[PDB]
Design a protein around this nucleic acid. Sequence first.
DNA 1: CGGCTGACTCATCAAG
DNA 2: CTTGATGAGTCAGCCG
Lengths: 70, 72
Amino acid sequence: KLCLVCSDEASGCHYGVLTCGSCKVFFKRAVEGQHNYLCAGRNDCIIDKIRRKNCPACRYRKCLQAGMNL
Amino acid sequence: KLCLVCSDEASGCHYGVLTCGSCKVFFKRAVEGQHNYLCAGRNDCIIDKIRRKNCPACRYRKCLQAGMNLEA
DNA sequence: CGGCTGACTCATCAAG
DNA sequence: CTTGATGAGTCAGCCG
Ligand SMILES: [Zn+2]
Ligand SMILES: [Zn+2]
Ligand SMILES: [Zn+2]
Ligand SMILES: [Zn+2]
């Protein structure tokens, strides 16, 4: 019952994937607007409830890898 | 906290107006369905929790007079 | 209906 | 102060 992107409690199947609400609207914002997020680490940041704001780049990558799409 | 159309307990701002769930669904089917509504009295019916089922014409008219709009 | 999911809005924070 | 990112809340269509 866990968000496949950040492991928060999932609220439902959004854009094809079991995710929480915050990840649902994160993906929609990221897929429409500008694209160029930059990772400050090595593109494998830990994305969980407490750290998901740190790296949009890695959070967006995980959304794609889990299969989110419009 | 009461539906502006039938005075039943309101549920939220629906189609631009504070209304109940039943009136919300009624209004959308009225706007979009093929509907020959005719009042059996004087186009001035009492519309409440029970009587709203009797006169869809007056119920509709009240929906529109209250401001409901599917675009709102 | 009411469950499901998407669109939209707004308060709160971080940054500058 | 302003700007931008975040996430919670409300209400929309659709479906059964
Ligand atoms: Zn998540
Ligand atoms: Zn990263
Ligand atoms: Zn009502
Ligand atoms: Zn009537």
